[PDB]
Design a protein around this ligand. Sequence first.
Ligand SMILES: O=C(O)[C@@H](O)[C@H](O)[C@@H](O)C(=O)O
Ligand SMILES: O=C(O)[C@@H](O)[C@H](O)[C@@H](O)C(=O)O
Ligand SMILES: [Mg+2]
Ligand SMILES: [Mg+2]
Lengths: 386, 386
Amino acid sequence: SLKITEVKAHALSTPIPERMRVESGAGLKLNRQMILVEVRTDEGVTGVGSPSGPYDLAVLKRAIEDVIGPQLIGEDPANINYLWHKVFHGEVSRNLGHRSVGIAAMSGVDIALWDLKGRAMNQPIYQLLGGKFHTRGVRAYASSIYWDLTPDQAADELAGWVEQGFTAAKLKVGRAPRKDAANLRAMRQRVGADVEILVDANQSLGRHDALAMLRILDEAGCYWFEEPLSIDDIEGHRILRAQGTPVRIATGENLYTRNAFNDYIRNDAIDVLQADASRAGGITEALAISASAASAHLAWNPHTFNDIITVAANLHLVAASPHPAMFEWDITHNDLMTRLASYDLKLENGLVQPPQGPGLGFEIDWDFVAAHAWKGEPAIGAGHGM
Amino acid sequence: SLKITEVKAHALSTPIPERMRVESGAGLKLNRQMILVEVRTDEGVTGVGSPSGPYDLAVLKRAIEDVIGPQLIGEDPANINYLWHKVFHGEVSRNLGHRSVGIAAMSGVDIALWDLKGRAMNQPIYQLLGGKFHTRGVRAYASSIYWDLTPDQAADELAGWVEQGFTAAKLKVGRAPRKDAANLRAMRQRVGADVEILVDANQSLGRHDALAMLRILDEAGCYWFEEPLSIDDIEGHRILRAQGTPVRIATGENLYTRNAFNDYIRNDAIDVLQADASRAGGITEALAISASAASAHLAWNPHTFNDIITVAANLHLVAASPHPAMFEWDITHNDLMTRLASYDLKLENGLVQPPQGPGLGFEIDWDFVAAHAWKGEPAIGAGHGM
Ligand SMILES: O=C(O)[C@@H](O)[C@H](O)[C@@H](O)C(=O)O
Ligand SMILES: O=C(O)[C@@H](O)[C@H](O)[C@@H](O)C(=O)O
Ligand SMILES: [Mg+2]
Ligand SMILES: [Mg+2]
């Protein structure tokens, strides 16, 4: 057997050229940052992970190394299930909060344990999970077309991603619903019916404005309506879904553990569960959520947006899952997507394939890591919702 | 990458001395039988499985070899998720029925694919599933004390199993409710409060008789009431569960796929889901049911009763699952529990451990297999419920 010797959190920051900084309800992007989790063992098998973002890097590092870490030192890393519960019940739930940055921290560590397990077995994670369902590849969408655009500019950006091979893309909405509607109508007109258009309000609307927007989305044949309302307003999501349109009500990037999603399902409030393996509790928890969605005849299509590790962790799960694919691919300026590891975006007929090596299935460029240590830069401006 | 070259179903029968034949609502046992599934590949990596029983062996063999098999020949066995859906949607659901012996047949093949995957990776299945949760072992129960006994005899048999190390055991009921009650009362007095007593009616009661019995079970502090009613009467189960007693309402050995269990959960009709990996759709399907149970704050404790393969397949999953264990262990006369493979019952403080070899984790005695080919013997007498 192996024993865990260290749990490390490397805080990393990468710059965004001013002209490339985008804003949504979540805030204006400043720097693309991450924690790279490293779980090390006595025999030298190592796994890495990421607890996503934006979350404060010092908070994440402290939680990972000094709250979670001590629960892992000396333990056999093979018992991922045991360790998830030891950590959640022993420290994280009460001492960081049950729906919290602590759960994202746990997620990064869980992903590292799965990477470690795959590497120890010399197998890609998706093979551990019963192999592929999506044998030909996984349909991706370009994320996203952000705020501050004219209708023709928005349509131009969409045409651009479609040219690159994408069969679907997502539009940010919320700040100015009349502009959102104009943008959406121009975009649909430009690409026709063969391209799926997703919309994401980042919790920015109230119920009545969301009902008004849903009518537009329905007219435009939008695939889903993501975070239409505060995640705290479950009944509001039920009301939207009860309209019975072909537009899916989607949420989950800010909901944590299977428990949050159970509450939405129980209240008939959700069509697409978006639990991110790197946020909602780990690969371990995302697996459970995906299964629970299928039991209820609903879909699981994760949020994946932060770095190439959060993308890869989710992609292994998605490739293995029978849910129809609508896989989020961050197309914004992001060095953490392109330079962190040996794995890049390759679309074939609009599909991506998970990395094929052991564990997460690629190698970290530790030179890049050594060159991008965080020195206190902020990741994102203040969010909206006030 | 491997390719599947054959899917074989070995029909086996083993006798039961008349003195050891037991009866429940399911019928009088005559012979302990099974299909040993064998999936072979071009490179010679082989997996085995079992679709449980009692199901007619010819129906099983035909389904496995000639309905399911043709969907598998030539395919990569690593893609278990893909193959499950290829088989279900392509053939089994419509052409064998959605809640059928066809699903059990699929389950035997799915287990064989998981055994194959584990053997190919040189890992026990529980390691693939995220490793152990129950690191110290899995709490087992002695299954079961059957019909036809006096209270004196029932109490004595229970004391015998407790002496062997069991901390829990199950009693068959349903033919004579007043005698059942007397047996239970004698059993509880005999062993005290520290031993869990489960009850199993094998669908043999009507609603009002089950309500009356539940009062008894509550009095005796029983752990669960298994198949109290027809599996077809979901509302009846809701009514029992709505009494709010500490007695769990349990069912699932005769329910198939996650869909059956979702219907029970949606109707507030179940405390313990008993989906058997070898009946309800495979390891693949049981994993999903276990997760769905947890999401709903309910328990998954599988039915495991037929042979050492059905026991082992479930035990890998149970060991890896955070559900409190109440693991079924057939203590009746059954050569398929003792002579088929090199994995015996070993209790330590009432706990069992999964096999530790690759795949299911033990080797088949192929000489025993060869010497016990089915010759048309029946497995079980007519069941009850009419
Ligand atoms: O840019 C943003 O709005 C957020 O950081 C993302 O998480 C976004 O909600 C998404 O769905 O990827
Ligand atoms: O012996 C019997 O009653 C059945 O064959 C079993 O399946 C039983 O219901 C059990 O829970 O193991
Ligand atoms: Mg979003
Ligand atoms: Mg039973």
